Amino acid sequence: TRKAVIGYYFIPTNQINNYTETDTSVVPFPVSNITPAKAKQLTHINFSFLDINSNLECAWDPATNDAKARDVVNRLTALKAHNPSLRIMFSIGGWYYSNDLGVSHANYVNAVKTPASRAKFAQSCVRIMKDYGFDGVDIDWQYPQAAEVDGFIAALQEIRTLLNQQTITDGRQALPYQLTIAGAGGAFFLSRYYSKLAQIVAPLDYINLMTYDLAGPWEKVTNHQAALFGDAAGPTFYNALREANLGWSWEELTRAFPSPFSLTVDAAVQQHLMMEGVPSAKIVMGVPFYGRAFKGVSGGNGGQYSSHSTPGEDPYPSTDYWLVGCEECVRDKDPRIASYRQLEQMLQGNYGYQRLWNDKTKTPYLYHAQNGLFVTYDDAESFKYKAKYIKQQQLGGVMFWHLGQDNRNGDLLAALDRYFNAADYDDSQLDMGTGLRYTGVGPGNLPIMTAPAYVPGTTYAQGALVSYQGYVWQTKWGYITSAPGSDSAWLKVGRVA
Amino acid sequence: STRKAVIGYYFIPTNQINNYTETDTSVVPFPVSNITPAKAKQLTHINFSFLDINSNLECAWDPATNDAKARDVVNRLTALKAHNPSLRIMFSIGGWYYSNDLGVSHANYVNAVKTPASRAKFAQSCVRIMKDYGFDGVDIDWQYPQAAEVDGFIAALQEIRTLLNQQTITDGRQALPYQLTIAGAGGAFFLSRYYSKLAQIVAPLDYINLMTYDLAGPWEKVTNHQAALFGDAAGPTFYNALREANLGWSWEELTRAFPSPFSLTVDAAVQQHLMMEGVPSAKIVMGVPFYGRAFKGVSGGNGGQYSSHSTPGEDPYPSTDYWLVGCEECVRDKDPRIASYRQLEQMLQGNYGYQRLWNDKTKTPYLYHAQNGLFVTYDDAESFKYKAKYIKQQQLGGVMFWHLGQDNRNGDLLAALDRYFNAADYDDSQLDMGTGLRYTGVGPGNLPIMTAPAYVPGTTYAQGALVSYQGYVWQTKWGYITSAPGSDSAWLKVGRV
């Protein structure tokens, strides 16, 4: 089955309102930059972002010129003429609109509250989808928590019911309307809804993991923002999933959530697979088409794992643009982030950067010795390892943020497509390295084990193993005269064949 | 100034009941007349033991019991009330022999609490037995109900409480109400069976009498004190079974409440009870042993403490070798592994080769026989000074002990307990409680009082920040916290306002 390749197309309201395909100082990335070749390389384009208004319905930002919005969407849906499998999805949410302190956060919480609100919200999503010509709905709430999760789940279920009926009504069985969400790619935010992952994923075609932004100026130590595997020399983090309302014992939590651990792409994927009922085929790995930069770093390890003097707040609080050669940073007023397009140009500009590679994390980084700069980013080489991981782990595919950040020729997208589909690419001998893998085991993903059946009336010593009611259990202490189950003395360690 | 409870077990095997006499210790070692008026005044409760739960699922005497003899023995005990208007003669149902998992009547306990009808019939039989023989309350000693049986056990106790309170009104006993108590586990391993529902178990009781002894024994590989008040870092430590109880707490919560490994001591048991919300200190009674446990084959260097040994742990004693030199009662009872304080005192004053030593951390005595390689852990009037001070400082309900027949002829241990609680001329203000290890877990029931600024919606908090909300003080487990305590898993309750 073809791997999904989901690329975000993000355009701010002011660019839609002044949309033009002949002035990059107004619209840096017009839809006309997406050629038939690029369209064939994508399976989904996530148009972003729509929002939820105070009337608790899906809607465009009110300042949007509707005619111009339709025109932009039309340019994207016209790409389907070049690829019969391509879907132009629309995404509702994003950090700015939906974060806890975001401008529309209350609308997300309130829309999912009751059967009536969820029905009204769900119907609005399908109305918008049909009115503008989209092929599916993507929800990007960053992120629901606590009492909001059950409502969020019911909302997704309702949208799924409505989309499925719309597929039949429209005779779209060959290209059914889809439903996806962008999910947390790190344990801190993931802990908010982790316990109910199976219910969240059930109504979805895919859950697109935001496996990037795992490092940044807001952290005290420089690090790779999207390491595939861990580097013991790099920083480690508290495993927040140990605090999710799971109802597991101390041993169970400890075995499932080693801590401290390496915040990596592999960690997020494995944390999702640890939960029962989350299929690998629905998990999509996200990758960044941009890098993050730090200043005031020390040499020694190429700027890796160093203290730094980079402002961590937003917006960038200063007027000094210190990322040498990054003119894009000047225009966007932030020297802490840059598109791959720009980073690649900086590499061809003889500006003093050295491209280095970490063979444990399988990601590149730039080090500017002279000025004390470190940049963590991804490229066609790190994507070889990530694509092989997607294949080996049987994931659904890849997602990326965002199309406008690829170089002009679209090389990163072309690479992803090549690694999944080209007859002339062979990664059978690609060595995945010895970087740290996430090895937690959840009572939801126990290995097959074999042990003698439990015998009532028997007294068991510490560490004894027995099979009982479908699982293999181990004693945590001695003189056990109780049967396996809720009784504190027994630990579920495997599944009986 | 509420009087501390002093609860002594009066245990009498059936054959002694059937051959009861107060003029021939060869047949009845400890007859009721040995409880002089002076001793009766020092007790608040005598727990007559043991009754059982029969196949009919009702409280009952041992079938081989001569009922007329039993009634006469009981009447002799209730006659003691003539010397102490506060004295209650309770009866205890259970004990290890009848109710342990592999015990002869275990099935009856599990079955008696299964349904509303089985419970009503069982509860009714307890009150009937109480009234018919003239007892003043019901003590249940099931060792011990398991997780699946706990809810039934709780409901049974609530039923008995309801019937007892009705009987108190019907009998005009407002001045000395009928009581309900249980003997509770004094070590974490057995306590973990019902720990999660401690509050519910304790609600219908006047007292929960902790069996804070037998914390060392031949079933353990390392010799140790069986009732250390506080811990000795040089002694063995144990796995904290409570972290595996069915609490539903988070990793941080479980970890801070249940350090592991830990020192199995009397203080640990008491503090573990106080950590639960709804368990009042006034209902907690500290058990103490009037007997010592002996080990053979110990080595030197620590006076016999913390040594490997060659003592059989099975019951009955699997040999005919009575190796506890000087212990005549051990031959009588065919078991050299247990000796009454009465017998130990005689062995000490004899010239048998024992040396009495004192561990100033655990605040308990022990005997070491250098010639034969023997170790004995026991309690005496000196260890009782520290335990009585602890009962007062911690505002516990009182003390319980097993058993009356093991005190010396002058009743010195019972007299000591009464002295430490009630003598106008005893002063323990200067008694040094030592530097032994205290149990430092913190749970919902013993959060320290603290102050912190009120939580403010919309504020972002760093790692370690403290706020007050809903009457508790909370601290963040990581950074960039954007929601409220009780809704965001990043907050840990660490104090009480």
Side-chain angles (χ1 to χ4, degrees), chain A, chain B residues 1-408 410-497:
Chain A
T1 166
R2 181 179 184 178
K3 293 306 182 189
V5 177
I6 300 181
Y8 273 84
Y9 180 81
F10 170 66
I11 181 168
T13 301
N14 73 301
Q15 284 182 214
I16 289 173
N17 291 347
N18 294 298
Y19 189 79
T20 169
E21 309 198 311
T22 60
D23 196 339
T24 54
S25 82
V26 173
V27 176
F29 189 67
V31 179
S32 51
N33 280 204
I34 306 170
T35 62
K38 302 184 192 171
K40 288 175 183 67
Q41 290 164 357
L42 288 152
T43 58
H44 300 72
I45 289 172
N46 282 356
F47 175 84
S48 41
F49 283 104
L50 264 75
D51 191 20
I52 297 184
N53 65 21
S54 68
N55 196 42
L56 313 182
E57 290 179 310
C58 173
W60 289 82
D61 161 358
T64 307
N65 176 306
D66 193 59
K68 293 296 290 173
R70 286 173 191 276
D71 177 78
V72 175
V73 178
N74 293 340
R75 291 172 190 280
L76 289 166
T77 61
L79 297 170
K80 295 161 67 179
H82 309 305
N83 175 357
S85 298
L86 176 66
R87 290 185 170 79
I88 303 309
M89 306 285 282
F90 68 103
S91 300
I92 306 175
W95 180 264
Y96 178 75
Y97 292 146
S98 79
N99 81 88
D100 290 352
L101 299 164
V103 305
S104 303
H105 184 258
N107 303 339
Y108 291 72
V109 172
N110 293 142
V112 306
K113 282 197 186 162
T114 66
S117 70
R118 293 189 289 267
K120 181 176 189 180
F121 171 55
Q123 281 151 26
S124 71
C125 290
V126 184
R127 281 205 318 280
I128 290 293
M129 186 190 76
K130 290 307 296 293
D131 189 15
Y132 295 82
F134 292 115
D135 303 305
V137 178
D138 175 64
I139 310 299
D140 294 9
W141 180 353
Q142 298 176 29
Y143 306 78
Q145 74 180 322
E148 309 161 354
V149 180
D150 285 358
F152 177 61
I153 289 161
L156 293 169
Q157 293 167 341
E158 172 75 343
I159 293 168
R160 161 61 62 187
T161 299
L162 297 187
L163 288 182
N164 278 12
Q165 181 57 55
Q166 199 62 228
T167 292
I168 296 170
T169 293
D170 294 350
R172 278 284 283 264
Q173 294 88 336
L175 196 69
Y177 298 116
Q178 290 187 155
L179 173 67
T180 63
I181 72 174
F188 296 104
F189 283 116
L190 179 59
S191 73
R192 288 181 172 209
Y193 58 83
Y194 187 72
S195 71
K196 301 171 178 172
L197 257 188
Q199 299 99 296
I200 289 169
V201 175
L204 311 184
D205 287 284
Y206 304 101
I207 173 166
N208 301 330
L209 305 185
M210 291 172 278
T211 33
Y212 38 70
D213 283 354
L214 304 179
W218 56 90
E219 286 300 325
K220 78 174 189 301
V221 184
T222 62
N223 185 32
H224 302 279
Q225 70 158 338
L228 175 53
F229 299 117
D231 180 357
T236 55
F237 293 79
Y238 178 115
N239 195 326
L241 303 182
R242 302 178 155 189
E243 300 300 298
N245 188 6
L246 298 156
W248 295 351
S249 72
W250 186 97
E251 294 286 1
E252 288 180 319
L253 293 173
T254 296
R255 186 184 188 192
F257 313 123
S259 184
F261 78 113
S262 295
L263 195 59
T264 65
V265 178
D266 166 70
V269 173
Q270 296 305 309
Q271 287 164 346
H272 282 73
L273 294 171
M274 285 212 284
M275 292 298 287
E276 195 165 50
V278 175
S280 64
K282 286 192 174 180
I283 295 172
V284 165
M285 179 196 298
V287 302
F289 269 28
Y290 62 91
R292 292 187 173 281
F294 304 67
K295 70 178 187 67
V297 312
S298 307
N301 209 345
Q304 285 179 118
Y305 320 144
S306 166
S307 53
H308 66 91
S309 61
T310 314
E313 72 260 55
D314 298 302
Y316 184 60
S318 173
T319 56
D320 155 40
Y321 302 125
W322 45 260
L323 190 55
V324 180
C326 184
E327 300 198 349
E328 183 192 82
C329 296
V330 176
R331 290 188 299 269
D332 297 334
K333 300 174 186 294
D334 194 338
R336 296 165 313 177
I337 182 175
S339 65
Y340 170 81
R341 181 169 171 174
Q342 178 66 94
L343 291 171
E344 185 178 60
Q345 280 168 179
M346 285 150 62
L347 274 183
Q348 307 282 176
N350 198 198
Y351 284 111
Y353 291 99
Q354 166 151 52
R355 178 186 175 281
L356 301 167
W357 174 262
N358 184 304
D359 212 44
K360 284 176 184 305
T361 65
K362 297 304 189 185
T363 53
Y365 57 110
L366 308 183
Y367 174 52
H368 190 100
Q370 176 175 154
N371 294 202
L373 278 30
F374 170 76
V375 179
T376 166
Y377 71 112
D378 270 81
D379 68 3
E381 181 163 26
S382 67
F383 288 171
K384 287 184 186 183
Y385 297 91
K386 289 178 177 175
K388 178 153 176 176
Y389 187 87
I390 284 166
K391 290 185 279 185
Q392 292 176 319
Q393 290 301 305
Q394 294 185 278
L395 306 187
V398 68
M399 170 275 276
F400 59 89
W401 174 272
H402 64 88
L403 281 166
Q405 294 172 147
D406 199 346
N407 61 20
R408 191 67 184 73
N409 281 148
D411 294 335
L412 299 184
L413 168 59
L416 290 171
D417 172 69
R418 178 180 305 117
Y419 305 155
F420 291 137
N421 305 300
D424 65 15
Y425 174 72
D426 175 7
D427 60 10
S428 68
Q429 308 302 315
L430 183 63
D431 194 285
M432 298 297 283
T434 57
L436 308 178
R437 313 319 218 238
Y438 186 84
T439 48
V441 168
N445 97 287
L446 300 324
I448 292 299
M449 283 182 75
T450 301
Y454 167 73
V455 176
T458 298
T459 302
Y460 292 92
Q462 183 172 307
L465 289 158
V466 304
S467 54
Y468 193 67
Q469 313 188 318
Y471 298 89
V472 171
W473 305 80
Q474 183 166 47
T475 57
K476 294 169 272 198
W477 57 88
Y479 296 105
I480 307 307
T481 55
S482 58
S486 64
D487 175 71
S488 68
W490 296 92
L491 180 58
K492 180 183 296 176
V493 296
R495 287 177 296 118
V496 169
Chain B
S1 66
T2 296
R3 181 180 179 177
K4 294 305 179 186
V6 178
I7 303 177
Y9 272 84
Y10 177 77
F11 166 69
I12 182 168
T14 305
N15 76 291
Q16 270 174 57
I17 284 177
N18 303 344
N19 296 293
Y20 193 81
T21 159
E22 317 198 311
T23 51
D24 202 325
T25 62
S26 70
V27 55
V28 170
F30 191 70
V32 182
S33 51
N34 281 193
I35 304 176
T36 61
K39 300 179 192 171
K41 288 172 166 54
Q42 298 168 348
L43 291 151
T44 58
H45 302 66
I46 289 177
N47 281 356
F48 175 87
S49 48
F50 283 103
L51 264 73
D52 194 18
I53 292 184
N54 64 25
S55 178
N56 183 41
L57 305 193
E58 296 187 317
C59 171
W61 289 81
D62 168 9
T65 306
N66 176 321
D67 192 58
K69 299 296 290 177
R71 293 189 186 261
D72 180 61
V73 170
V74 176
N75 295 339
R76 279 161 192 293
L77 285 161
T78 58
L80 296 178
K81 290 159 75 182
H83 306 294
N84 178 357
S86 294
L87 182 69
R88 285 184 173 87
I89 307 309
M90 309 281 283
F91 71 98
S92 300
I93 307 167
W96 180 264
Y97 177 63
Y98 294 137
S99 74
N100 83 84
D101 289 356
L102 308 181
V104 296
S105 308
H106 185 249
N108 301 342
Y109 293 72
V110 175
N111 285 151
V113 302
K114 280 199 174 186
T115 64
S118 56
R119 296 194 285 268
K121 181 179 190 181
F122 169 59
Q124 278 157 29
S125 66
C126 290
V127 184
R128 233 152 47 219
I129 289 289
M130 187 187 76
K131 289 307 303 292
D132 193 25
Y133 290 83
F135 291 118
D136 302 301
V138 181
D139 171 64
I140 302 178
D141 299 358
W142 180 350
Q143 300 173 26
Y144 305 78
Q146 295 173 50
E149 306 149 353
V150 180
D151 286 344
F153 181 63
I154 291 167
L157 295 171
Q158 285 161 174
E159 205 49 40
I160 292 169
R161 163 58 57 183
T162 295
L163 300 182
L164 283 182
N165 279 3
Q166 286 174 4
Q167 199 67 52
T168 289
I169 300 308
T170 300
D171 296 350
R173 289 276 287 264
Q174 294 91 332
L176 191 77
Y178 293 121
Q179 288 189 155
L180 174 63
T181 62
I182 71 175
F189 296 109
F190 286 116
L191 177 60
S192 70
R193 288 177 169 205
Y194 59 83
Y195 188 69
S196 61
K197 297 171 186 175
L198 250 193
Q200 290 175 255
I201 289 171
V202 174
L205 315 179
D206 291 279
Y207 303 104
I208 177 168
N209 302 330
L210 308 188
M211 288 178 286
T212 33
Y213 40 72
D214 289 346
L215 301 177
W219 53 85
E220 280 297 320
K221 286 188 64 175
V222 180
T223 62
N224 186 202
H225 299 279
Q226 66 153 333
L229 176 54
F230 298 117
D232 179 356
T237 56
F238 294 84
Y239 182 102
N240 195 326
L242 303 185
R243 73 183 187 186
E244 295 299 288
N246 326 96
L247 296 156
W249 296 359
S250 78
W251 190 94
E252 289 290 357
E253 279 161 6
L254 291 169
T255 301
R256 85 187 171 148
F258 314 119
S260 186
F262 79 113
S263 292
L264 196 61
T265 62
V266 178
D267 165 68
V270 174
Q271 294 307 306
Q272 290 168 338
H273 280 71
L274 298 169
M275 288 200 297
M276 291 302 273
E277 319 170 74
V279 181
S281 68
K283 290 189 173 186
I284 298 175
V285 168
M286 178 195 297
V288 298
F290 273 26
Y291 62 90
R293 283 183 175 278
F295 299 76
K296 66 170 181 71
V298 304
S299 297
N302 298 299
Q305 307 173 96
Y306 321 141
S307 161
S308 58
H309 64 92
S310 61
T311 317
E314 301 89 3
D315 291 312
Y317 179 58
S319 170
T320 181
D321 180 21
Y322 307 134
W323 45 259
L324 189 57
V325 184
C327 183
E328 292 182 60
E329 309 195 333
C330 295
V331 176
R332 178 191 74 194
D333 307 330
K334 303 184 170 69
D335 196 335
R337 304 173 296 183
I338 287 192
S340 66
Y341 173 73
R342 177 186 305 207
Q343 180 67 77
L344 294 178
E345 181 172 72
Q346 291 183 185
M347 288 154 64
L348 255 182
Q349 57 194 33
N351 188 37
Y352 296 115
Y354 294 97
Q355 316 163 27
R356 170 183 187 285
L357 303 170
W358 177 266
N359 182 306
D360 210 38
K361 294 266 181 183
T362 65
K363 297 295 191 179
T364 53
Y366 57 108
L367 309 183
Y368 177 50
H369 192 285
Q371 184 197 192
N372 290 29
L374 314 176
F375 169 79
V376 181
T377 162
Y378 70 110
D379 269 76
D380 66 6
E382 299 306 303
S383 65
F384 287 173
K385 293 183 174 199
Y386 299 90
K387 285 174 181 180
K389 178 156 180 177
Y390 185 91
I391 286 165
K392 295 185 281 185
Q393 290 175 141
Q394 294 292 307
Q395 304 188 302
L396 305 186
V399 69
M400 167 277 277
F401 59 89
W402 174 272
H403 64 83
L404 285 165
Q406 296 172 324
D407 196 348
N408 63 16
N410 283 319
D412 289 335
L413 296 185
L414 167 63
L417 292 167
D418 173 64
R419 171 179 308 116
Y420 306 152
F421 294 139
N422 306 298
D425 52 6
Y426 174 72
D427 179 346
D428 57 9
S429 58
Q430 299 186 352
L431 186 65
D432 169 65
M433 295 298 276
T435 58
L437 305 178
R438 269 64 170 167
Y439 187 85
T440 57
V442 178
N446 70 325
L447 284 179
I449 293 175
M450 301 175 142
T451 50
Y455 166 75
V456 172
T459 308
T460 302
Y461 297 87
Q463 182 185 305
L466 295 155
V467 303
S468 56
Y469 195 60
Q470 300 184 153
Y472 299 88
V473 173
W474 311 72
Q475 176 169 54
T476 58
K477 300 167 193 164
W478 54 85
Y480 299 110
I481 310 313
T482 54
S483 200
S487 300
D488 189 319
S489 299
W491 295 96
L492 174 72
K493 189 180 298 182
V494 299
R496 186 166 40 77
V497 180

